Design an enzyme around this catalytic site. Structure first.
Site, PDB file in Angstrom:
ATOM      1  N   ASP A 116       0.839  -1.194   0.000  1.00 23.70           N
ATOM      2  CA  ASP A 116       0.000   0.000   0.000  1.00 23.70           C
ATOM      3  C   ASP A 116       0.876   1.247   0.000  1.00 23.70           C
ATOM      4  OD1 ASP A 116      -1.922   1.899   0.329  1.00 23.70           O
ATOM      5  OD2 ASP A 116      -2.386   1.392   2.410  1.00 23.70           O
ATOM      6  N   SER A 142      -0.726  15.610 -11.952  1.00 20.20           N
ATOM      7  CA  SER A 142      -0.974  15.254 -13.337  1.00 20.20           C
ATOM      8  C   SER A 142      -1.214  16.520 -14.151  1.00 20.20           C
ATOM      9  CB  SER A 142      -2.185  14.325 -13.417  1.00 20.20           C
ATOM     10  OG  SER A 142      -2.594  14.078 -14.750  1.00 20.20           O
TER      11      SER A 142
END
Length: 330
Positions: free
Chosen positions: A35, A199
């Protein structure tokens, strides 16, 4: 040193991925959920409340000659999905894919929430976010990667998750045969303890690319792709009959639909998520309403590039002094 381990979807939907991890001496192999959105290595154990164990493999520290109780240490964690666990702490030898760390903090669960009990395939979590998020008190502990870093050939790990198939976690090296083209690297902020990046925009299907900054985290422990409501609405508007359902808890779409791809930007590069990756199947057995793999982050507080996005790429988690993330197509 290096390590390399295969990671395997837990079910036919790729809800999560499990990777075998050797703990203790003799080894006890547990299948852990790696994770990158958390920083605790915790396991079902011989200390876990018996009614809260249902099919998981447990770690028994009393059977490990290298286990040592970390005196006074406790831990307690709550995840973004509302699940939680807590317990005490041992140090022990932990190996992943041939890479060994001695003295790793292994957090033994005394209590786990129902969603963990109900998933027999996941024996615990191995956190790969920054150690500043580790919950052990009163002395915070380091992640497996942080402990291994100095010994690795290069201070990196890579995630290569499969679509409906196994994939690979590598430590200490970048397998140049595992991706196409080049890897585009992008800046990371560690201020919240995550692999947080920005992004450069998105496209829906064959549509034009929208240049827009989307801050979010690269999180292998989250199944879906959680993005701003504007972006998510633009995606699902291209699927006839798709709608946000408050009762189901997100966007659903007719199982008869063909889903468009979704592209996200990494610098000037582009990662394309095929439409099929966005199908999470019937909302309940036999239903013709299917659950979408791109959902709004509005109720989270952060955008999350979970498995739906990451499995479309070869992803480099560069833990150099100034960390960065790399993405390549594959």
């Amino acid at each position: 040193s290096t390590g390399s381990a295969t990671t395997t979807p837990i079910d036919s939907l790729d809800d999560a991925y499990i990777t075998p991890v050797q703990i203790g001496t003799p080894a006890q192999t547990l299948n852990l959920d790696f994770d990158t959105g958390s920083s605790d290595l915790w396991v079902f154990s011989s200390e876990t409340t018996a009614s809260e164990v249902d099919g998981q493999t447990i770690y028994t520290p009393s059977k490990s000659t290298t286990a040592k109780l970390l005196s006074g240490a406790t831990w307690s964690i709550s995840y973004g999905d509302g699940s939680s666990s807590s317990g005490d702490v041992y140090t022990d030898t932990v190996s992943v894919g041939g890479l060994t760390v001695t003295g790793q903090a292994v957090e033994s669960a005394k209590k786990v929430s129902s969603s963990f009990t109900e998933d027999s395939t996941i024996d615990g979590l191995l956190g790969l976010a920054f150690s500043t998020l580790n919950t052990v008190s009163p002395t915070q502990q380091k992640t497996f990667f942080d402990n291994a870093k100095a010994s690795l050939d290069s201070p990196v790990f890579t995630a290569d998750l499969g679509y409906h198939a196994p994939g690979t976690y590598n430590f200490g090296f970048i397998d140049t045969t595992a991706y196409t083209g080049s890897i585009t690297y992008t800046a990371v902020s560690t201020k919240q303890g995550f692999w947080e990046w920005t992004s450069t925009g998105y496209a829906v299907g064959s549509g034009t690319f929208k240049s827009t900054s989307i801050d979010g985290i690269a999180d292998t422990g989250t199944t879906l792709l959680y993005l701003p409501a504007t972006v998510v609405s633009a995606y699902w508007a291209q699927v006839s009959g798709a709608k946000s359902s408050s009762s189901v808890g997100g966007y659903v779409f007719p199982c008869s639909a063909t889903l468009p791809s979704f592209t996200f930007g990494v610098g000037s590069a582009r990662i394309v998520i095929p439409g099929d990756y966005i199908d999470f199947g019937p909302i309940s057995t036999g239903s013709s309403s299917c659950f979408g793999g791109i959902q709004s982050s509005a109720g989270i507080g952060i955008n999350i590039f979970g498995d739906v996005a990451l499995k479309a790429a070869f992803v480099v988690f560069n833990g150099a002094t100034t960390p960065t993330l790399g993405f390549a197509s594959k």
